[PDB]
Every structure is written in C-alpha cells, then in structure tokens.
Symmetry: C6
Subunit: 276 residues, 6 copies
DNA sequence: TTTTTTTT
C-alpha cells in the first residue's frame, strides 16, 4: 500500500511478534520488557498493540490447527513414567481404547458427538489434568458462570473449550446444543461485536449429571435424547491420592504420540464401559 | 472531485475485494494475510476497514438477489447420490414438492408465508440439512437467545435468517410476528443506533412446539391461529445414520438446479403430509 | 456566519440531498453507487453525513408537513376501485364518516383526542395494510418493545407513530399516554439526551383489547377510563383470504384527495357507528 | 484572556442568541433558516455548539429564575377573561386563596412546603394546565418513569419540575424525600457523570392516589406523614366543558398580576378550604 | 516540566481554584463567568477543566482533613445561641458529652466504633442538621437510594458521610459492615471503575428500624451483633416547630469550635442516658 | 523502536515510578506532587499516567511475588508484643505448626490446598488482622458483593484475594471452585474486556458456615467434597481486649522470619487439632 | 494535519 517508514516499522514489529508466538501481555513482558516499554512510549494509544495481538492470534489459529501442537518427536514407550496412564488404568479403562478416543476427539473423527463429559469429584484427577491440557495448548477458552449476559465470551476462536459444572438455564440450552454440535456459527458478544466460531474440541469438566434440564427448581427431561446423542460419556470414580497433580506437558505429548502411532477404529458407543 | 490518493486506494481495495467475493475477516486473512498486514501497517486508524466492510456488505445486500449466487448450473439426475435427497425420500416427503416449496420460499413467492419449520428433535436428520444451509449462504443473519436486549444483533440486512427455539417472551414473539409478515421495519440496533430490517427469508430449526409461548411458569398460546396461518411446517422424525455426514454446497446447488428446472405448482397446504 | 470555503460545500451538499430526497442510507445507496466514492474523495467521516441527514430531516419536517404532500392533485376517478374503500365497505363502517375522522386526525382538530386505533381479528390482514401505510410515508416512527430503556427512538420528531400488538407495563404505558395525549413535551431520547414531541398521529396495531392494563402478571383496571378518553373507539370484524396489502404511493394520495373533497361534520362520538 | 477570532465569533453568536432570550431552535429557524443553515455549515468542531448551549443555559439559570419572568404587564380585572377561574368556581374552591397559595409557592414563601399535590386524570383537565404552564416557562423539567437507572436524569438544575403519575418504589422514595427538603445535593447520572442539584420548585401531577406508600407489593401509610407535612393539598374532580383549554402566557401573567395586587396571608394549612 | 504557556495557564488556574476552594461548576461560574467563558472559548476539548477540578479536589482532600474544616477562629461559649443545642437538649442529653463524642468521632479516636445510631423520624430535625453539616464543608457524602447497586458514588475521597433511612437488602450490607469497621478497602464504584475507600467519618441515621438484617425476604439478626458492638445508641424524639430550619454553617462551626475548646474523656457507653 | 525524546521521557518516568514501587496514583501524589504537576504540564492527555500505573502494577505482579513483601530482617524474640501469638495461645492453636502452614501457603508449596479458611464471629477482632494482612501486601483484591454480575472485579492480577461474608450463590459457586483450584483462568472484566488471572491465594473472612450452599432461598448439601477438601480450618471465638487492633507490618515480618527460622513439615489435614 | 465510551 504505502510501504513507507511507519508501514515497514509496523511490518517488522508484527514479524518480531509472530516469529515466536506471543498473544498475551505477560508473555511479551517476560520476553522483552525493554521493547514493551519502548513500544508503549512510541505510541499515543493502546489500540495498535491490541490489533497486532488479535491479528497474531487469528493467524496462529487459522494457519495452525490443534493436532499439529500435539505431535511427538521422541516417544518414551513407558507405562510407569506417566501419571495419567496409572490414573486411567486404576479406573479399569483400556489404554489403547482411551488413546484412540482422545485421538478421534482431538482430530474430530465424528463431529456430531464431539463432547467429552466427566463424572465425579473434581479433586480426583480432573482440574489438574484440565489445567495441564489448557497450558499445553497456547489457545484455550472456558465457559464461566459469573457472566449472566453472555457465558461464551472467553471462547472466541480458540483451539480447546472447557465447560465447568453448572445446571444451565433454558435460555442457553439451545446455544450449548449448537456449540457442542461442532459447526462454525456466528455469535455476538455484548454490543456491536459479532464473530464466528469454528468447530473446536470441547471438554465438560463437570461433577454431576447436567444432561437433565435443571432450571432453578424445574427439572425437565424434554431434551435428554438430543443431549445424549450429541455428547459422549466418560464417568469414572476413584480416590486419587494426594502429593501429585500438575501434569507436565512431556507426558501429554508422549500420550498424544502414542495415540497417533496406534489408530483404533472406535464405534459409536455412548455408555463407555470400564473394561481393559 | 478531489480524487486524492486515499480515494484511489479505497477504490482499488474495493475492486480487489469484489473481484473474488470476500467481505469478511477470516476469508481475507486466509486469502492474503500479507496484504492484510500491509494494509493494517498503512492506515493508522481502525475505522477505514470498518467503513470498507460496512459499505461492501451494503452493496452486496442491495444489488443482486440471493439465488443468483445460490442456484446451480448442472443437474444431478439422481436421487440416491445426494444425502439431502435420500433424507427427503426416507422422510416420506415428495422431492418435486419440496423443490417447488424451496423455490417459492427463496424467490419470495408468497411473502407472508415465509417460514420453514422443523418439528421434532434436531438430531433426526435436521443437523446435516441445517449445517448445509448455514454453509451454503456466505453472509447470513442469526437469532441467538444469548442477547438480553435485541435478538437480531447480526441481522443488518442479510440474505437468510437462522432461528432457534427456547423460552420466548413477548418482545421476541412480537418481533418474529413482525418479521414473518415481510416488512422493512426501522428498529433500534442496541444502544444509540437503529437500522431498517429488510424482508428476508427465514429458517427455523426448532425442537419442540414453537407456536407455544413459555415464560418461566406461564404458558400462553391463545394467538396460535395467526401464527399457524402465517407460517408453514415440515414435521419429520426419521433417524439419521452416522458414518456419512457434513453436506457440502454441491448437493444444495444440484437441488436448487433441479428445483429451477422442473417447475411444479406450489399449493397452499399448511399441514404437509408424508407422501411422495 | 463565518463565511468560509467548507461552509459553501456543506450547504451545496445539504441542498443536493434535499432536492434528491435522501434521509437515511437505503435511498442513499439506491440512488447511485458513486455517492460513497464522492464522499470518500471529499472527506472521510460519517459524522458529517449523519449531521447532514439530521438537519435535512429537520428542515423537511419544519418547512412542510405530512398533509402538504400526502394529498396530491391527481384524484382517484373511481370510488369503488380502491382497496382502502373496499375493506372499509367490507368491514361495514361509514365511508364519509371515516373519511372525515381521518381528515380531523390529519389536521389534529381535537388535540387530546387524535389517535388512530385498529382492533379486530388477525385473519383479515391488517399487518400488510399497516406496512403499506408506513412505507408510503417517508417520515414515520415505531414503538420499540425489545428494550425498555428508550422505547421511543425512531419516533423522534416524526410525523406518524406506530404501535405493536399486545400489552405493556405501566412505566411505558404512562409515557405512551403522555405522548399520544396531545401534549408537546420533551423526554429522554438516547444516552444522556432529550427530545421534544409534538401531538402527532399514532396508529395502534393491537388486535386484542389493550384497555386491560396488565403489568406482566397482574391485571389492573385503574387506567382504563383515561386511556379510552384519548382516542376514538374502533372495532372491525372481517375474514379475508389472499391478495391484500402492499399498495403503491399513488392510491394512498388518491384516497386522501377523495376524502378531502368530501367534508363531513363530526361531533365527539366515542364508538363509530356502522350505519351507512 | 486569549482574545482571538474564533473566540470573538463565538462570543458574538452567544450574545446574538441571548439578546432575544431564546434557548430553543425552532424559533431561530422560523426567524432566519438561512442564518441557521449558515451556522450549521460553519460549525464543524462537534463541541462548539454544545459548549455554547451549555453556557447559555448556565447563564439563563444563574441570572434570574422563572416566576419573575411571569410578571404581568397590565391588570385585566375580569373573572371571565381568565379561563383558570372557571375551574375554581365550579369546584367551589376559593379563587383568592388559591391565587395567594400559588404566588407564595412560586416566590418560595414557605421554603420547605413548596409542592402542590394534584389528583385527577385527563377528564379533570390537569394535564392541559400542566402543559400550558410548561409551555409558559421557557425551561422546565419532567419526571419520567421509563428510566430504571436514574429516573431524574432530565431534572438536573432546572426551574420548575413536574412529577408524572405513578406509584413510587423504594428506589425513589428517598430521592423524593431529599428533593422535597430542598438542598444542593450532588448525585450521579448514569455512567461517569455527576452534578449538584439546587433546591428547585417541584409539583406533583398525579392522577390517582399517590400519597399511599405502595412499594411494589408493600402497602403502608407510615411514611405519609412527612409527605403531608412537607407539602400542601389540591384535590379536585370536575369534567371539562366542550374541548376547553389552550392557555398561553398572557393568562398566566394576568393571573400573577392579580395575585400580586391582592396578597392574602397564608399560614401552614394542609387542607385548603372551599368557598368561591 | 517544560514550562510553556498552557503550563503556566493551568497552574494559575489550579492556584486560583485552591485559593478560593472551588471544586464544582456553579462555584467557578459565580466566581468569574468571564474567565469561564474565556477558557471555554480558548480550548475546544472539554478535559483540561475536569482535570484541574479533580486535581483541586484531591489537593483539598489530602492537605485539608475533616477537623481542619470544623475548627473556628472565635469561640462563643454560650448555650442559648445555637439551635442544635436546643434540639439536643429538648430530649435531655448532655451538650458537653455529645460535643466530646462528636469531636472524638471526627478525629477517628476509636476506629472500630465510628458509627452513631440516631433514632427518630423526619419530625426530629435530622435532615436539617444533615444538610447544615453537608453545606458547612464543601466535601460531603450522602448514602441516598438514588443510585442502583452501589449508592456510595459520592462518598469516595470525601470527609463526613451521612446515611439515609432504607431497608438495606443483600446488596451493600457487607460493604457497609466493612466500612464501619474502620479499614480502607479497594471496592468498585458504579460500573467499570474502582477506588480505595479509607476509614472516613460516617454517621448512620435510621428513621424506622434498620438494625435488623433484612436480606431480600429474610429478617434475621446474624450481622446485628457486630453492628451494635461497633456502634452506640442515641435515640431522640421531639416534634419540630414552625418557621425553623436551614441552619447556617457558622452555627456548626461555632459548635465544633466550642467542642474542640472544652474536651471531655469519652469512654464506651452503648445506652446513652438522658441526663446532664 | 524509534527511541525519541518523548520515549526517553516516558522511560525515565516509568523508572522513577517503579524504582521504589507505587500502587495507585494517590501514593505518587503524596510522594511528589511537584513532579506530578511537572509531568501533567509536560503533556496534555490523561492516559500516560494510567499506562504508567498499569505497567508498574504488571511489573510488580509478575516479577515480585508476595513473600518478598512478607519476610523480615531480624527476629525480635517476644511473646506479648505480637497479637497472633496471644490469639493462638488463648484459642489453643499450635505456634510452629500454624507458622509452617502459613509459610507453605504464602510461598505456594501445596498448590492444591493453597487457601486459608477462617470461621467465627467478627467481634473477636478478625477485621483488624485482615486489615493488617492486606496492608502488609502491596497488591490485593477483595470480593465485592455489591455488583451481582461480577463480584471478582478487583480480584484480577492480585497477590492475594479476600472473601467477605456472603451466601454462596450457585451463580458464583462454580467460579469460586475454579478459583480454589488454582489455574490461570481467562475471564471477562466488566464490559468488552477480558484478562487471565494467575493462581493466587485467597482468604475467607466470613462469619457463617460455608459448607451448605445457600442461594438465598434454596439450600443444597450435595456437592461439598471438593470445596471442603480444598482448604484448611482455622476457627476462633475468644474475644480479645477492648479497642485492640490496627497492627503494623513489623509484627508480620517478625512472625514470618520466625517461621522461616524453624520450618515444620506440613501435611494435608482439613480439621486442624488444638495442641499448642 | 491532529481524535472518541455500554445491563437486572
């Protein structure tokens, strides 16, 4: 367009911002507080940095998918060096079956039933694994319960989505059913801000059974069949011992590589048994 | 008049975006992220791109009709190759009658009876058709229930409208009744804004009874006669097998071509039977 | 006043917009596609365009009124060949009496008793007639029900206001009574703003009995006599089928001229008699 | 201090607009639409006209009040010329006592007891008198019940305030009690906007019973004693003649002159006696 | 730091503001409308005046405390010259004891017990004394029910804050409890704002019963024990007289000077006896 | 990176602001209003100071932690000067055990159980200890129970969080559970603003029971294992002396130094025993 | 050649 001096400066800034992959303020701060202060002083407003971060995020989300961030360069081929393996084996779940299920969920094998739901207390190997998976992926969104006008504000073009425990009201049942269906749909934000959402893997980190439509005090089961047909079931109950947690990304990468190296065709089974 | 460099660059950008048919954000990104970064480095503000997108959308909405870029140019001459045709055959609906109904709905043959209802659960053959309809239209409006102010925050003169079910208050019911009548009504956007909504075809993907008005604990349906008189229906409850899925745009193009080719007289039948 | 260079250009632009008849964006785009190009070559801000539109609308509303152009010179040349006359004779009301009542409503001979009321079944098709009447008038407003903050946003210093269907709460009922009660008064328009209101005709499109003040769940009757003491009682019963509404801008002016050519004395009768 | 050209032109325009004492815009339009269009074309600072109107209103509200502007030019001495005496004669109220009470309320004789309570719908003609007095005073305010955050947004540093009919809630009882006391109280608007309101005369234009403490669902009368002791009473019910009303400023000036010519000492009396 | 023309200009403006104690708009208007108009015509963007007013307010709040605005320059040493003295002695309380209690409360001697329970309706004259105290010092706070959720919008960076009568529901009960405890806390303002409230002198006035914890629909006394533990008791009941009110600031200044002159060691007594 | 005069000035200002650590703007004002006015004169906008405070807070929250502002320099070896020692001696809590527990909680050692729960009435003196702890830490946040839409407004990017007394409503129970888990969660702010919160310790300062989930009208005792095992138990009910509060930071520093001098092995234990 | 803010 202009390719003058300011254009070249902004181009080199975008290059130095996207060469390593930084979309948060703290990341760029820890990378180079010096350049951060220099850019903050060499600008009257704070909209240019926000636009650059948004462009970098859109580029890293459209060009790079999700399984590319789960590739393994060197497997470990061990069963005792991974805590998640022992966690899934203590509940009777098959390792190869769970690996194939995770591979099909991450790479979107089915599409319609792309929803992972858990049952049991969150302090028995749930919140720690969720935090580890959210830290392993550079982009992650969560559906909180604090915002009442729009609970889907922190999930705008993300690689993975998290759904905490909570009996959703009837005003968001259709929205949740359309989000879990897996389709790039257009949703607003608050005021003059509409954006599209691409099919992305979701994980329901709930504690109880949210399939029943529970609105305050009304317990209806009119949408139980579509909810059961659009989601899976991964119920497990086991007292996970303390002095653990905080799963590193190395074990996650190793398990993802083991799942990618062993592809097993899994049929449409809702009630996943505890065999293996 | 002045025809400075800014107006020339704006005209060049308009020509470049209309030469391929890109009036969004992610499409232009995937097309030429390099050119997008160059344009963002050129202009220092963020209102120029907004005005460009606004006038481009206005031109695309106030020029040619939707079927002009939705109809096909090659028939299929088959009934088992397309997934939508197989679904319509298994549902009992006549292919020629459904094609004539779709042709009359797209070209606004009736005007007042511009409603496509989907009675029954959505996970019974409706998901694939809904996905194909949503992916066929480039720019369409949606009515989400997450907005607690205006249900049409993304319907600023679009091609087709997507509708969802749920708890319907009096305001949204009156808005739907005014929209179904086909009238460009000037209504406020959200806050300190207003727009003139143009009569556009709508598609409802309900699950239960959409004619009933349910609000918390109040169930009213006294005005069901005008609602059922100013709307159509398409009840279907056939199971949709897995494996195959995700209908693209070629099937919709072939269906529109077959509808435009074979001309079938459209009747005023509200309660459509399951024969043909 | 200062007499500069931009003032003459702004005056010429205002005169060109007034002579061409451009008050919003729909006609602004439908007139010529080079208007946006000329604007971009001249300046680069939508605030100037919005101010031009605002002052042009203010000039058109202050200099001339609605009956100044609603009654043309070309008559109808046929009393029977008229859709409005046809539906009026089908409803059973008096033609000359209704014409004189409409004439008194247009000139506001009563002040506090000048409000059009439409009551009856929805099978006749009053929505299409209301849409046609609203489209034949360039300056018109409607009561918005989606937001309870500022329900009177499009009817700011307009010529004719339109109402929706159903009931409303007391907070908006009082404002409606103050507006249609024949009293030039100012009220909050937008965010931290105010706008005056002149006794202008209001058309209620409520097909049900709006005299029952229902505040969402409690049905009251203390605001029924003063509500009915501000407009004439109207009640029509007729069942139609198809082919109704969507009239041109010439038949309305022909009917207006035919009604003006026949002046009938009207007293202060509440319910309009169906004799004649 | 600065003494420039733009400041001199702004001061000249301010003096020209305050020379006649007009704070509206329609008067200036009807006077010289040409000069109005010239000033609109010469005003492109989107802040100069706002500051001009702000300082003009501040000068109009800081110099003289409103009742002093309602002084009579010549005494008429005729009970048939003033149309406001017929209502008092029909209702049996004392004309001289009511005139003295109104004169004491306008000149702030009692100080705290400076509020008149009304009782009557549109049939009594109180709304017409209120509209006439509001049109007589060049600047007034009205309480709107449509606002939810701040209902007194259109009543900040005014001359005379009107109270619309409506059951007060718990969120406005304290505000009304603080306003009735008369004090320069600082209150916020809607978002990042605060102002200090001066003790200003208010008057209630309620149609039904308002003194009864009806807060949502709580009906009490314990808080009625302060409202009865902080204001007088003026309840009357009498139907109008044959579309009688339309009072200008000459009648108000004549009434004020007649009240000033014959001043009657009025003590702290709540229930006004009848006789005249 | 460059010492330019605008620098010296706004420095002289801030000096003139802090020399006379002007922090609002009407004060500066009455001080010098000429300079106000000159400054409004000099700069177009209205922000330099608000910044100067905020700086002057912060300077007056940081340099000058609350007791510095209460002590006078000439004592009177008389009991038959102050109206508040007669008001407090009509019940039977001791003047010197109440003066010493007020002096200890204004100096924040206790800290935790910084609230005095004042029982009595509007007939006791609490509103007049509250208005006199609020007008004596240019910085005051009023806990009125005008605001929605956060009524402490005009209490931040102030001195004396007077409460109002109102059944506080489950909204700001915990905030008030933390405020009366004598501890600064960073709390949010109205919306999209936050500020650190410091232990400021507060006086709670209850016309009816406010000590009971009325949370929505539950009337419990769980939070009442610390309430009565961190506050005293001062009940007064006396009917006011006619032609009395509007206490000047000089009376309160002389009262505070006499209180600072003669001091009395105040211990800890809840049920204050009516003697002395 | 350009490195100009304004950039160097902003860099030196940031250096002079973060050389000692400044939180809000009132601290910098009271420190050097001279240089504050100099900086206000060097510029014109009011965003440079905001950006300076923002980056200073970001640096203080990212680089520095919490124990860095909690460690002391030399123990004082006293048993009567400290108040927490007397509190734990009168209640029966173990000195070294509680010291090691607090040291492990402040230095983030447990991870999953990095919280502290308090129980008992507020009349014993917990408010003074909470104020002292909040003053010992520079950056801290509190749960504002006023705004029901988002009570965690001031709890974004803080070293420690405080939880006031209030019922655990189901709309915030899930957010509180996610906060207790300890994960950098991305949540919205107030309007069109989102931020990522890092695992920060929280301290409950309630006086009622937090086991049974009470939502004002409903009560549930089902989901309680995670929220009951993700915290400890430190209750106290012994009342201290009268007017005994306002603790400085020297006592806290001495206690932290004494705890660091003698470290006791901390183990996972909910119901703490009394043995010291 | 110089700039603007939203809900029960």
């Amino acid at each position: 367009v202009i390719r003058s001096k300011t254009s070249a400066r902004y181009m080199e800034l975008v290059g130095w911002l996207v060469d390593k992959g930084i979309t948060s303020e703290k990341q760029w701060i820890q990378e180079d507080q010096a350049s951060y202060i220099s850019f903050n002083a060499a600008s009257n407003s704070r909209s240019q940095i926000k636009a650059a971060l948004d462009n970098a995020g859109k580029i890293m989300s459209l060009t790079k998918t999700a399984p590319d961030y789960l590739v393994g360069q060197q497997p470990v081929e061990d069963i005792s060096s991974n805590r998640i393996y022992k966690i899934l084996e203590l509940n009777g779940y098959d390792p190869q079956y769970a690996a194939s299920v995770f591979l099909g969920w991450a790479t979107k094998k089915f599409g319609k039933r792309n929803t992972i739901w858990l049952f049991g207390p969150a302090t028995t190997g749930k919140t720690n694994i969720a935090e580890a998976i959210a830290h392993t992926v550079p982009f992650y969104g969560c559906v909180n319960w604090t915002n009442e006008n729009f609970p889907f504000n922190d999930c705008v073009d993300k690689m993975v989505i998290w759904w905490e425990e909570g009996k959703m009201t009837a005003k968001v049942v259709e929205s949740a059913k359309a989000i879990l269906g897996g389709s790039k749909v257009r949703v607003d934000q608050k005021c003059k801000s509409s954006a599209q959402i691409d099919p992305t893997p979701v994980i329901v980190t709930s504690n109880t059974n949210m399939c029943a439509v529970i609105d305050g005090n009304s317990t209806t089961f009119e949408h139980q069949q579509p909810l059961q047909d659009r989601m899976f079931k991964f119920e497990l109950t086991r007292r996970l011992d303390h002095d653990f947690g905080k799963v590193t990304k190395q074990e996650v990468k190793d398990f993802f590589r083991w799942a990618k190296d062993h592809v097993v065709e899994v049929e449409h089974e809702f009630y996943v048994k505890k065999g293996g």
